[PDB]
Design an enzyme around this catalytic site. Structure first.
Site, short mmCIF file in Angstrom:
data_model
loop_
_atom_site.label_atom_id
_atom_site.label_comp_id
_atom_site.label_asym_id
_atom_site.label_seq_id
_atom_site.Cartn_x
_atom_site.Cartn_y
_atom_site.Cartn_z
N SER A 102 4.66 -4.78 -9.90
CA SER A 102 5.71 -4.40 -8.94
C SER A 102 6.77 -3.70 -9.55
O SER A 102 6.85 -2.73 -10.26
CB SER A 102 6.05 -5.57 -8.06
OG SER A 102 6.63 -6.53 -8.65
N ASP A 241 -2.96 -4.79 -0.96
CA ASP A 241 -1.50 -5.02 -1.60
C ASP A 241 -0.34 -4.39 -0.91
O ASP A 241 -0.43 -3.45 -0.09
CB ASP A 241 -1.44 -4.06 -2.90
CG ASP A 241 -0.55 -4.45 -4.03
OD1 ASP A 241 -1.08 -4.54 -5.27
OD2 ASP A 241 0.41 -4.97 -3.56
N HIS A 268 -0.98 -8.27 -3.61
CA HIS A 268 -0.13 -8.03 -4.60
C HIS A 268 -0.19 -8.97 -5.85
O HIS A 268 -0.32 -8.53 -6.98
CB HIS A 268 1.48 -8.19 -4.02
CG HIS A 268 2.37 -7.60 -5.04
ND1 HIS A 268 2.35 -6.32 -5.18
CD2 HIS A 268 3.65 -8.22 -5.44
CE1 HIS A 268 3.52 -5.88 -6.00
NE2 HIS A 268 4.14 -6.92 -6.12
C1 LIG Z 1 9.58 -4.17 -3.18
C2 LIG Z 1 9.09 -4.00 -4.45
C3 LIG Z 1 10.45 -4.11 -5.22
C4 LIG Z 1 8.26 -4.84 -4.84
C5 LIG Z 1 8.45 -6.53 -5.00
N1 LIG Z 1 9.54 -6.97 -4.38
C6 LIG Z 1 8.42 -7.03 -6.56
O1 LIG Z 1 9.20 -6.18 -7.32
O2 LIG Z 1 7.94 -7.84 -6.73
#
Ligand SMILES: CC(C)C[C@H](N)C(=O)O
EC number: 3.4.11.5
Length: 290
Positions: A102, A241, A268
């Protein structure tokens, strides 16, 4: 088990966990997401040590067990220099593979753009080259949610009532659909989520939750730069995802020779939904590019 210790990087204490593989074939450095989570949820990747792949885990600045630098340093650029300083301090001149999840994937891409000469390969899972795009795609997913949850997110999300029970319910539904599909969440994942809510990086850099990126990286977008990456690259993304395959596609299109894999029935945190399949794919990729 792995060795755990503190590394003095750029003046601050950064926690790292190096899990060496018996008959080492290569080293894999990992970048957790958030931003502002912890390495904890990526621990499933330890299984690769059995494949001769040494995995290095670490809590980025202000995350988990690591120290928090001045707020002015809460940037992806700093995170890149931190990763390099850590690589150099631990492995010197040895080239390694870099994996990011991510935001960690975004951090990995930013790193590669400037230091790909220090890498043998790149792996991006549920990563992104553009925050605006990621936001747009997540909004689409929100509109696909049941009216109840869709209105709760818009209504309370606009009033900043992320504590509201109805809102929390909508967030939970979204996560079990695009974060970690209806299964049995492991301790490693819960620990990372808690670390994010406790430290200050997530709130400042990212925002309240996964699908609400109102932090300081809201306009970040290096899609026009990643195309400079000329090293073997593996891009993975879950079918459901939260960082959609469309977002992954954008990265795949810019990196010549890169491979794109979309995990069916996954979202995800694919490294937990299909642990064996995920670890097998990564190890397969790594071992073919020594
Ligand atoms: C929204 C993005 C920053 C992806 C997610 N929150 C992550 O980095 O785990």
């Amino acid at each position: 088990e792995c060795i755990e210790n503190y590394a003095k990087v750029n003046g601050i204490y950064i926690y790292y966990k190096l899990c060496k593989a018996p008959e080492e074939k290569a080293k894999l450095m990992t970048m957790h997401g958030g931003p502002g989570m912890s390495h904890d949820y990526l621990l499933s990747l330890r299984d690769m040590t059995k494949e001769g792949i040494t995995v290095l885990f670490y809590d980025q600045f202000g995350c988990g067990r690591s120290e928090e630098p001045d707020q002015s340093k809460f940037t992806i650029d700093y995170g890149v220099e931190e990763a390099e300083a850590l690589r150099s301090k631990l492995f010197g001149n040895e080239k390694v593979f870099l994996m990011g999840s991510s935001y960690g994937g975004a951090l990995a891409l930013a790193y590669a753009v400037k230091y790909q000469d220090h890498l043998k390969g790149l792996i991006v899972s549920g990563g992104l080259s553009s925050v605006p795009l990621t936001v747009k795609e997540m909004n689409r997913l929100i509109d696909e949610l049941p009216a109840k949850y869709r209105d709760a997110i818009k209504k309370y999300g606009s009033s900043g009532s992320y504590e509201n029970p109805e809102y929390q319910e909508a967030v939970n539904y979204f996560y079990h659909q695009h974060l970690l599909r209806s299964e049995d969440w492991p301790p490693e994942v819960l620990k990372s989520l808690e670390y994010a809510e406790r430290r200050n990086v997530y709130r400042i850099m990212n925002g309240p939750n996964q699908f609400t990126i109102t932090g300081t990286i809201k306009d970040w977008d290096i899609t026009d730069k990643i195309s400079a990456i000329k090293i073997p690259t593996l891009i993975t993304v879950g079918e459901y995802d939260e960082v959609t395959p469309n977002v992954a596609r954008v990265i795949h299109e810019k990196i010549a020779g890169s491979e794109l894999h979309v995990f069916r029935d996954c979202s995800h945190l694919t490294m937990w939904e299909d642990r064996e399949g995920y670890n097998k794919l990564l190890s397969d990729f790594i071992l073919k590019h020594l």
